[PDB]
Design a protein around this ligand. Structure first.
Ligand SMILES: FC(F)(F)Sc1ccc(Nc2ncnc3ccccc23)cc1
Ligand SMILES: FC(F)(F)Sc1ccc(Nc2ncnc3ccccc23)cc1
Lengths: 542, 542
């Protein structure tokens, strides 16, 4: 019975194999078969390559020691090497062209979700080339998905020496019979076999995965499309910025590159971006997922006037100021989307690009008050301080389970809430668990709302007149910075139709649409949200 | 009697003035004198420029409204405009060439340090150009140095309307006679004069500063070179990352660009980089100033083995991992410098570049143990757990005041500490305040050391044998990534002479030296530390 899975990097989790490139180069340069592979493994355990794999020497130290081993191997073959020949050049392209073997990672991901202890076991070197980052980036992406990463140059042992295999077992804290090992090299496979481990020779991913699903008894091949990588809250970098004496803002930060500021809606968290954070950071962006004023680990002042658009926006500018950021791309959902359009209209120099999910940009009516624009029953229900708070705070588990659901799961009514006297009047006390959320994921929102409740979040609805008077100062402006509007087909609050005239105020407005998507866009359709944002960020946000 | 200073931006805090460019363009393009300035102020308070300055319209909306005002102004002059004429092009270079007027900022800085309430009052626009960032960056740099920033396009009022002047007074909470106002335009100066404010017409910075120092009674012109901008701890963005179950790391983060990880020494704080943080962030870098393991807001496990180089380095790699950073440039001082050389030798793919202050890279002697390499009396004094802790924790104010001092202030003895039985045996109970530190700055270190004391910091000294055995695995390697060694002339612990053979292991090693500089490099010689690091970062770290 198995509980551990071990993968090699070269030829198993990463394709094409770097080793195979030594052969291709001989075939392309019409060099005697094996010339470069003879120079590679020259001296065996006493040779330059073993010293490199054990961490005795770095990659840049090995490069000449390989070139002179290419000089010794050609003397035996009598032929001479070309003019534009560079060992560095061959390895640079070889390492560069090597990309993650997505199906192999998917299988590793699936095994780990089924309670397997996963690990990478590779014969690698200490990379000190000018272009070492590409590989550091690759290793970063892979490693997060595994329990352990055993690099030969770190452990000082190497494959096929049996010491690394006993080290593998001691690390995994498991009996060899509880271990599946996968390698593309028979030699590096034999010692695992001898110890009593299940071994899979990798020649093609499909057969290798067949052998894996055969022995594990878990579906790994042909399995449905997996959800994007999520966030474990405790494994994140949490940031805190005091924007003013009583007001502190919290964010979760991930990645390098242009600053991408994510603004959640009502009643949410930075956690509502759980599937976007790893994805956007992987796309080469510095993700700053906010806890908006009144939410989670951010300050929740009681006063209503503390949550009008002007103060909220001015506070987000101070956030940039204190973090040392002249600009950030502002991506907002729901009330976050509203904030994000005001950031663009009042502080365009602070906004690199602006993106909204479901929330349209609707210019204020200077004649009619927003309390009339009745023309949203829950809005009126939220006006009275204390009422909605008491209902939403009554049972937190119930509140989120009732709210957080797909279009095909709808259990909540937005119509005639006031006359019936409650948001959950015609709702079960123990609602069913939605297909978008796990019990654990709902508990995160429960834990966060236990800090300061719904007063702060609900105050975002209690500044209609202030927001209206303020927005009226922007009636002569146009949003001319890069902008994206993302509509969700089945959002019955923020309907796609409401966005139709947006090009009248944003001429260069780019668009995105998601079919069969509810209000809770990010958790409903994550893969497509990420696809839309990455494509727009790469084209309009640098 | 004055207590408030008000500066304009264009022509006062920023030179050359954008307004003057309208004249230069006429003079360069041989256009009828004033043509572009007539088109600029066309329509007066009902014109496009006033609408722009009040925030009714953005800069990109105004650009055509100015081009057609250049078409109307040329009909009256009868001449026609050239082919390669662009209003956007003129303003782009105009805004770009406008840089901070350093002496004017220095004077504002000096007034604020003398207890003045400082403010910027400018007639500006909402900038939505593709190149708006340059100006956003400029505004960011200036604003941090002032109590208030009143932008016309934000307040909806403009100069010379008297409403903005009464708004200025209400903001400052001061009587007009307690206010010095400075502008390069007589018109925008008159309403301040009428209200009873001190006014200074700016035509040349020197005369303007003479008038300022005359009326304020404070030396502003010819004054000594000021210290670089420091950090107010509460105004910083504080980051927290759990690197393992019991271990959490804290850092202060500022700026955008390549990640620069700052590693302090013993017995220090992220605060030891107070003068480098704003400077390096201003140079286009993402500063991550660490609280090393055992210090400040970071976890301080009691066990000695928790502070050996291998665990400390492996933990800094997890920090990169959890933050989503494939690489960072590692700048270390004292024990931080040591860490930083091991980061380069064991994880070169994670290090963009490596820099050390005072700490040389000395390869371990594989024959002789480090306990012999006696050939550092305080080292032996730190070996016994509890002894040094009790002395250093006895009076925290005394401990830092005795330690943190310049070469010309030396009161502490490193020689014969063990036989005398104490670090502060021949030291006063109430030491004098060093020229490098303020009483407040010493209290910050006192407050931080009150959390977990000296056990954690002192354990960095208690792993000699482990560090030695580990370092011996790197004896075959060379540091081939960009590297900088910065020696401090008067450091009697980490002497410049000790660095002499460093090129034997780091051939491409770049160097920096600071004359008349003690051990506490960063606070001793900040301006020169920043000068050296920025110059090396810009050339070797991208
Ligand atoms: F009401 C609940 F919480 F039960 S579901 C729900 C219902 C509505 C919204 N968003 C907005 N509502 C009203 N004006 C807005 C204006 C701008 C953006 C969002 C909104 C969120 C959740
Ligand atoms: F000792 C005090 F704290 F009183 S002054 C003082 C004295 C010495 C150091 N640095 C180092 N000491 C010993 N080995 C090292 C090895 C590497 C780096 C620094 C060191 C710091 C402060």
């Amino acid at each position: 019975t198995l509980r551990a899975a071990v993968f090699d990097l070269d030829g198993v989790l990463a394709l094409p194999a770097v080793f195979g490139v030594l052969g291709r180069t001989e075939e392309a340069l019409a060099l005697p078969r094996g010339l470069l592979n003879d120079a590679f493994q020259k001296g065996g355990p006493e040779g330059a390559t073993t010293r490199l794999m054990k961490g005795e020497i770095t990659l840049s130290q090995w490069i000449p020691l390989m070139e002179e081993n290419c000089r010794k191997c050609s003397e035996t073959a009598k032929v001479c090497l070309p003019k534009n020949f560079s060992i560095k050049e061959i390895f640079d392209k070889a390492i560069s062209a090597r990309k993650i073997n997505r199906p192999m990672l998917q299988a590793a991901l699936m095994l780990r979700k089924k309670g397997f202890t996963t690990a990478i076991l590779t014969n690698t070197w200490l990379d000190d080339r000018a272009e070492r980052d590409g590989l550091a980036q690759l290793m970063c992406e892979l490693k997060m998905h595994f329990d352990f990463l055993i690099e030969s140059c770190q452990v000082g042992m190497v494959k096929p020496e049996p010491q690394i295999y006993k080290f593998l077992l001691d690390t995994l804290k498991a009996s060899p019979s509880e271990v599946v090992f996968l390698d593309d090299i028979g030699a590096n496979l034999k010692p695992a076999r001898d110890l009593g481990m299940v071994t899979i020779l990798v020649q093609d991913t499909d057969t290798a995965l067949k052998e894996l699903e055969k022995v594990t008894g878990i579906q790994l091949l042909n399995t449905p499309a997996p959800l994007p990588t999520s966030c474990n809250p405790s494994d994140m970098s949490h940031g805190y910025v005091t924007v003013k004496p009583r007001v502190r803002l919290h964010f979760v930060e991930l990645g390098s590159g242009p600053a991408v500021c994510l603004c959640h809606g009502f009643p949410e968290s930075w956690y509502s971006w759980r599937y976007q954070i790893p994805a956007l950071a992987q796309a080469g962006y510095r993700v700053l997922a906010m806890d908006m004023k009144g939410y989670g680990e951010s300050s929740a002042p009681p006063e209503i006037e503390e949550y009008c658009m002007e103060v909220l926006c001015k506070e987000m500018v101070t956030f940039l100021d204190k973090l040392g950021l002249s600009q950030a791309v502002f991506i907002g959902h729901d009330w976050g989307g509203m904030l994000v359009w005001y950031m663009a209209l009042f502080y365009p120099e602070r906004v690199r690009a602006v993106a909204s999910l479901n929330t349209p940009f609707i210019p204020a009516n200077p004649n009619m008050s927003p309390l009339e624009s009745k023309a949203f029953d829950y809005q009126l229900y939220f006006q009275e301080p204390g009422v909605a708070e008491a209902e939403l705070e009554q049972n937190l588990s119930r509140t989120f389970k009732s709210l957080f659901r797909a279009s095909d799961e709808s259990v909540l009514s937005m119509h005639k809430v006031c006359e019936a006297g409650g948001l959950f009047v015609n709702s079960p006390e123990e609602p069913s668990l939605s297909r978008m959320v796990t019990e654990e994921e709902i508990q995160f929102y429960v834990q966060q709302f236990k800090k300061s409740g719904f007063r702060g979040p609900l105050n975002w609805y209690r500044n209609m007149e202030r927001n209206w008077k303020w927005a009226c100062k922007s009636l002569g402006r146009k949003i001319l910075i890069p902008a994206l509007m993302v509509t969700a087909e089945k959002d019955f609050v923020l309907v796609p139709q409401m966005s139709q005239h947006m090009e009248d105020w944003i001429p260069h407005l780019k668009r995105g649409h998601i079919e069969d998507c509810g209000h809770w866009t990010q958790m409903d359709k994550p893969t497509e949200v990420n696809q839309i944002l990455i494509k727009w960020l790469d084209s309009d946000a640098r």
